Amino acid sequence: MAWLILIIAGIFEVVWAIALKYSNGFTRLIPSMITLIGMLISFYLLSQATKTLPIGTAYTIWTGIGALGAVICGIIFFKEPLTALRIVFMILLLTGIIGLKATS
Template sequence: MSWIYIAIASLFEIGWAITLKYSEGFTKIVPSIITIILMILSFWFLSIGLKTLPVGTAYTVWTGLGAVGTVILGVILFKEPIEIRRFFCIGLILAGVIGLKITSAH
């Protein structure tokens, strides 16, 4: 169940990263409020997952999944450049996340 909490926390992390962009440096009130709520939810689910998972593994998976999702949505929503080198590096991050999950005793 802890891995599900980490996955949910990662989704909220992706959400707050994207809404942070829309908040334009916390100058737009609605996206700013949404960003803060998503940050709190992300940290809350991370903290639940950390009750039974090693902090280094859980934190790395949380940030790794968040980074991968944010890059993908950045390309879709903000027309960020699609370069093979970027996606190769994202693939390495994803491989590391999968490796940590597979080798985790939990």
């Protein structure tokens, strides 16, 4: 259950990471509100997760979800290079996350 919370926080991570660049110098209203709401939601869920989850696992899995979603959305939405190297890195990241959830 805390893992569900962790995954959702990792989602909001990438949503605010990309709305931050779509917002300019924190100037565009809609993207700035999206970033602020996403930051608050993400950090809150991360805290509630770390209450019952170890900090060393929760932090790195949150970072992994964030960067994985960033690369998913970059390859899909920004025509970013879909390198085979990037594919195998995504495999490494996902296997790490799932294996960390398996040994709970």
